[PDB]
């Protein structure tokens, strides 16, 4: 039955669970949080990170 | 008569171990919306047992 | 990641819409009394 | 049969942590903190580590 099979591997970037390149990103840069009244709190969001 | 101690083969074999993982090659189970709510908010519940 | 793509999209912008939204799809959203 | 299951090999990277990973980014560069003024209560709990 499907619906199920909910749980596989995805490949591609090394994207781990919580917040690796989505986030941001390794490669050669820095300083990275932008200007924004609602994206403070949207940066709260961002960085709970791990369960 | 004289022979066995000038093999030289194995460095560059071996030295395929340190360059079969570079990739993290760690993500599992995919999640995304796809079915009736019951087992999917603590995400595994049973097995981590892999690690 | 997970269900938090939330992100003020059910609240903020409802009983009136300062910033619009992206393609709103909203086959209906918002309720008046 | 188990399931108050506690602790485990942890094997893996250089780190020893208490609650030392809130940064799971530091590669090489420093200064990788976001900023806003007036609401910070979340700033304190990271920063003190050595118990």
């Known amino acids: 039955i499907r619906g199920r099979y909910e749980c596989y591997t995805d490949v591609g970037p090394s994207f781990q669970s919580m917040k690796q390149q989505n986030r941001a990103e390794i490669l050669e840069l820095l300083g990275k949080t932008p200007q924004g009244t609602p994206e403070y709190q949207l940066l709260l969001l961002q960085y709970f990170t791990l369960l | 008569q004289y022979r066995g101690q000038f093999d030289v083969v194995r460095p560059v074999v071996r030295k395929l171990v340190s360059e079969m993982r570079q990739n993290p090659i760690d993500v599992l189970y995919r999640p995304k919306d796809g079915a009736r709510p019951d087992a999917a908010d603590v995400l595994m519940g049973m097995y981590r047992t892999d690690m | ?33």
């Not at chain 3, 059910?10 to 909203?26: R, S």
Request: proline residues 6%; glycine residues 10%; without cysteine.
């Open chain 3, 1 to 33: 990641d997970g269900k938090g793509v939330e992100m003020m999209r059910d609240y903020a912008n409802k009983q009136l819409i300062q910033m619009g939204v992206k393609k709103p799809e909203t086959p209906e959203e918002q309720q008046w009394l």
